[PDB]
Write a protein that binds this ligand. Structure first.
Ligand SMILES: CO[C@@H]1OC[C@@H](O)[C@H](O)[C@H]1O
Ligand SMILES: CO[C@@H]1OC[C@@H](O)[C@H](O)[C@H]1O
Lengths: 763, 761
């Protein structure tokens, strides 16, 4: 047999052999893609007639065979097996396809669990739980023949106007990086032939667009770029061995990321050693012409993207077909095509596809992971305020009010299939409506818990109709407590208030929801405000008028149960904010790791009309119990520039309810050669404490973790003092101390540690 | 006599000779300063006792001998002459001082005219008038013995939250650069011995702080930095030969500007060839320690600032005295001190100070320039909206309402002396009294009106609303005059240190407007403010809106002249007005992906378009544009195109139009602005008059930075858009650059030349 077909040969040998056998047309085909829906008949069965035209010379990827066809898992598996058999048996060289799907909050197709949104995952501060989640998603994906998931999003978000805030892990490069590495490790596992390629996106800067506007310029200078935006991707590449990266739609300072070789090749491949594939964001190659106006036709767009380092044009071949013409016309060298093809073929061999590209359809039934979803939902909800009203007693009569108390659709995030696919909106409309039925409501959770309540919708999520207010106020007046549940509808269409393409300039709760809360509060009845939202909203006008506030980031299918569990104290809330909540849009940005001159206006401190401090800081989240921190140890007190310090604190649950605390480590530095954050998150640990239990939390902090870029753009650790601040939020610091680095400034070269190790031991 | 004393020797010879004669202590003293107020007794007279301690080894500069002492001009001149006599006659080498003052809106001291703020100067679009203004300031300053004025501000402002917006020339690097060069040329003149050193500030980026917050980081990437922020300074250095630069208090991406040699030396001196002095912003050296926490003590702060390229520590020696210790301890080389001292001494020789450092006290009386101030005020006011109510008839009974109608203090900007000094009580109060009020101008114009204050600028007291509503109901038209109080203290709403997050009119002024409008009477809203405010909630509720950037002493007359049509408004916005703070930033020169959210265009809750765009400004007449010519249609990469348009005043009132040229480019190797201002001309047209406006656009003017950070002109097509604002484009065409991509090296043209000529009969 040909060497490439022989599994006893090393993958490099099989790649070289296969590349040597391919025509230019076959090479270019491996750099493109076809939609799943382009390969089916009207009953969702594989169409050989359509394949003969689209797959005749092979293909790089199939885009969303499940997510784009509305097929159930076993039908999707059957379609993928038929695609693979056509490629294996009816093309000259028999190269199988790689299949991708969206999977941010679980496989995005019919039959897959809807996990809480990414911003909720981050709010758990529980990286191991997120690894458990993506290990389950891995199995769901492999069952249907999918090899690559387009997640996680490692964009660092400090601008809550942006509609994709909900898909991020928030404002902190450290927390984003740490959640990202766990996410990747769960999806990929150790041997990718048994796992799913993760795709970190959107490389890089995409969350910092001008004015918070989707695709607008992301104009970020170099040190901030390296330390804030690139850092999580760097960790994913070097520590988690991530196998795919997708580029950003935006320009950085005049250069679209899809046309930037300095970014997609020089940083990602040359400096960091990435060995996987770069896939385009959808249509990102074509819109170098149509949107950014830097390519005069599809062939120039193709050339810019290939030279930049995009290996696969998604979601369908459009410009990359012209790479054949560019070679034949002597505009680009076939060697450059070979380099991209080599990367794609290597990964296909690594995924085991030339040994076995099929799946057992009989096993393609995806299992529910409601259990994991509920654990994430229960740990992600944040208690922002509580004057003591929560937890509620079960004998109190409740007035349950607001659009998000009644409508299950609004629990869903923008990459949860039954929200996402609405962007296409009769057969599909009916299928969505049917599937929606199976997801539990907030109403259902209250009824299941046996609470006596009346429900009034109050108002819609959008619009200005206040005609439902009277009914809501009337039920409030006759109740013991009003629970007002307000917030977003997430997705990609005009009727949505958050999600990709739905950016919110002024951060007011949508519609007349704010006025609804305030009218209810005017009754004088105690008010629990529950925000079911995808972004921070300005709560300046309601915070002081309500008794408690729960932030529930778009929780997906487990949301109702977790909310009711928390309200009644069956679960003690333990989520912590992974992004600052501004007092108002005009305060943007607010974030915890400002420099000494950031987060204030000099010399009066505040704006004329507003504090410079967020309403709720990074790391904030209350509990139904109290935690007492004591006995800070920092050893040794002097370390050399590649040494390690060990920081320990004792934490005791001194209250009356069991509860988890997220202990946070912040590090500050002054008198470096550049300015540094007054405090920045550099470690954390979720610790479970029974009432009256005490434990020790231990952080092992290598100096590599503290490295920063100097005046000459070198990554350094300089001698001097580092401040250690340990506490329950970035403001609620409980114990502070310091240690010194002693010795000559160190340039940190090659591989280095990214993370503090965090453990618990007996006190 | 020693060579340095000999005026027949070349300045370089005198500098070298003097430097060779100085001790280290004398050298370091030339790099420092002392406040004017530190050298006076209780009677405002020079104190020899105080001088013996502070001036014994000479001094670089005296800070604000007029502005910090509350002396009248002739007393300030006498003080400065006595300081100079002490230096010349009682120090070993007899080196005189350079004196600086603030002068953005005129010499900032008793006796000086209060001109309209910088943002109003820009709204004139009349660079020659600004040159005329600073030529007058030059004379005022030289009369009192001042040699350097700390102006103009060339910070480009796209964030109206920032309290120093009023001190800028707005959002456009082109307009800011063009106004800046005229400003500098007027102050300095050709031979600086007869002029005043201009000080471009705050180098660079200071107007783009995080969140619009004063001194917060200005994190700007390189192409944007070079094209938007550095460009006006580059033009001032290379075209206007500016002789001083002041640094920014902010960091750029981890590096404070006062400690950044790459900025204050490598760009400014090495790349651009600047030969003057860099002066620190006030205390900017000291706060490398106290604020930015990158210097461990004052001697490290001194070393960082000297290595970066600051020549003079202002406003008083504090860290730079330790340069002596740093040399004596072998930490820095004396050669580095010598380099800075050379720059200071050169400029002192060029200013003529070793030949004559004194002024004639009998001539130190500063003349009023109310005439120039009134021309600027009349050309700077912008008519943002007019449903036809304006101009008003003089027979209509007016209800004049609002805090800014009655309070003269609120006409003043943050660097106007009688506002600034609020950060002697009888002297201030007396001088305030001499400035005409908006009330006074209505009375002088003979209008019948009643006045109701309505509310304060700040706070939430609505108890004055009833009286205002009552006078509105009894009038024909309500003229509601609202806006800022500008300055540096907590009671101020705009000005340095007074940043406004949410862009609502201060206090309950917006509610005042809306309550008055509920009467159903016509409303003319007059904004006397230092920054764009969100007008989303009032625009559709009022009949006309005038923006009056803080106009200084000529404000009342100009406003009333415009309201009644004695002057036809002709100002144009130099900065976009956002619909709301959440839309920030909005600016006219966005890339194809800027100024919109893809793919629905708008935000969920807000348009992505500003409420009023850059270049906007209405008139009481109509201008008709015709006959676009662009020649030649193909030009090589260092060629020139000539663009002509005819503009005719087709209405019934004489008026000025500001014709604007925008250039767009696509299919460059980097993304480019869909449109950006590249030329303009204020043209006067009598009713039924037609003229041709001519723009001569060298391709150098269109250069931009490519992927490799080279300044280039690339072949391709450029779109030409000529019109009455950045949105009100009246004629469009294009021309092509043909030939090989060009790297633009060395000196190049910065500006389009703009002229008028006769239109065809
Ligand atoms: C159209 O939007 C793109 O579609 C594919 C997703 O993976 C990317 O996140 C998103 O930007
Ligand atoms: C204290 O503020 C400084 O004082 C001196 C002025 O020239 C500068 O503009 C200003 O930033």
């Amino acid at each position: 047999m040909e060497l490439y077909r022989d599994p006893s040969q090393p993958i490099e040998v099989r790649v070289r052999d296969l590349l040597s056998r391919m025509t230019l047309e076959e090479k270019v085909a491996q750099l493109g893609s076809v939609w799943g829906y382009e390969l089916i008949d009207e009953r969702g069965k594989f169409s050989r007639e359509k394949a003969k035209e689209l797959l005749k010379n092979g293909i790089g990827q199939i885009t969303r065979p499940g997510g784009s066809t509305n097929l159930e898992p076993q039908e999707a598996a059957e379609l993928v097996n038929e695609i693979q058999r056509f490629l294996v048996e009816e093309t000259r060289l028999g190269i199988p396809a790689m299949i991708h799907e969206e999977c941010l909050t679980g496989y995005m197709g019919l039959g897959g669990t809807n996990f809480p949104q990414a911003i909720a995952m981050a709010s758990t501060w529980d990286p191991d739980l997120i690894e458990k989640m993506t290990t389950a998603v891995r199995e769901d994906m492999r069952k249907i023949g999918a090899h690559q998931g387009l997640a996680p999003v490692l964009d660092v978000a400090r601008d809550p106007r942006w509609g994709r805030t909900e898909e991020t892990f928030g404002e902190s490069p450290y927390l984003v990086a740490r959640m990202g590495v766990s996410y990747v490790k769960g999806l990929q596992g150790e041997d990718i032939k048994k796992g799913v390629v993760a795709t970190v996106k959107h490389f890089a800067g995409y969350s910092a667009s001008e004015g918070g506007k989707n695709w607008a310029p992301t104009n970020i200078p170099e040190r901030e770029f390296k330390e804030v935006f690139l850092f999580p991707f760097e960790a994913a590449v070097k520590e988690a061995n991530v196998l795919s990266v997708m580029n950003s739609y935006s320009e950085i300072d005049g250069v679209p990321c899809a046309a930037n070789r300095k970014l997609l090749t020089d940083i990602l491949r040359k400096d960091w050693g990435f060995e996987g594939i770069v896939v385009s964001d959808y249509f990102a190659v074509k819109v170098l012409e149509d949107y950014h106006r830097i390519a005069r036709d599809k062939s120039e767009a193709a050339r810019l993207a290939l030279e930049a380092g995009i290996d696969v044009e998604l979601p369908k071949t459009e410009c990359y077909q012209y790479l054949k013409d560019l070679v034949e016309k002597g505009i680009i060298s076939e060697a450059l095509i070979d380099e991209a093809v080599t990367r794609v073929l290597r990964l296909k061999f690594m995924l085991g596809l030339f040994e076995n590209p099929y799946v057992e359809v009989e096993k393609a039934k995806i299992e529910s992971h409601r259990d994991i979803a509920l654990e994430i939902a229960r740990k992600s909800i944040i208690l922002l305020k509580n004057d003591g009203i929560l937890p509620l007693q079960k004998n109190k009569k409740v007035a349950l009010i607001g659009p998000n108390a009644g409508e299950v659709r609004n629990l869903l995030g923008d990459y949860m299939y039954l929200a996402h696919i609405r962007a296409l909106l009769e057969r599909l409309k009916k299928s969505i409506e049917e599937h929606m039925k199976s997801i539990p409501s907030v109403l259902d959770a209250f009824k299941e818990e046996g609470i006596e309540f009346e429900y009034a919708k109050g108002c819609e999520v959008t619009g200005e109709d206040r005609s439902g207010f009277e009914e809501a106020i009337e039920i409030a007046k006759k109740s013991d407590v009003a629970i007002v549940v307000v917030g977003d509808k997430s997705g990609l269409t005009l009727d949505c208030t958050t999600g990709e393409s739905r950016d919110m300039a002024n951060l007011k709760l949508p519609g007349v929801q704010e006025e609804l809360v305030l009218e209810v509060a005017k009754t004088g009845k105690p008010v629990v405000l529950v925000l079911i939202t995808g972004r921070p909203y300005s709560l300046k006008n309601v915070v002081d008028k309500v008794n408690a506030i729960l932030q529930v980031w778009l929780p997906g299918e487990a949301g109702g149960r977790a909310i009711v569990d928390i309200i009644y104290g069956k679960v003690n809330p333990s989520g912590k904010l992974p992004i600052s909540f501004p007092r108002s849009a005009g305060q943007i940005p607010v974030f915890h790791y400002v420099k000494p001159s950031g987060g204030r206006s000099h010399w009066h401190g505040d704006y004329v009309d507003e504090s410079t401090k967020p309403l709720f800081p990074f790391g904030h989240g209350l509990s139904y119990t109290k935690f007492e921190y004591s006995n800070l140890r920092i050893e040794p007190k002097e370390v050399p520039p590649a040494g390690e310090v060990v920081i320990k604190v004792d934490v005791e649950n001194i209250g009356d309810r069991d509860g988890d605390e997220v202990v946070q480590l912040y590090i500050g530095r002054e008198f470096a050669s550049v300015t540094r954050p007054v405090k920045e998150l550099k470690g954390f640990k979720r610790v479970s404490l029974k009432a009256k239990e005490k434990k020790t939390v231990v952080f092992r902090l290598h100096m590599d973790v503290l490295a920063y870029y100097n005046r000459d753009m070198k990554l350094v650790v300089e001698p001097g003092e580092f401040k250690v601040m340990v506490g329950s939020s970035s403001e609620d610091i409980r114990l502070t101390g310091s240690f010194s680095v002693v010795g000559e400034k160190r340039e940190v070269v090659g591989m280095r540690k990214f993370f503090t190790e965090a453990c618990e031991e007996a006190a």
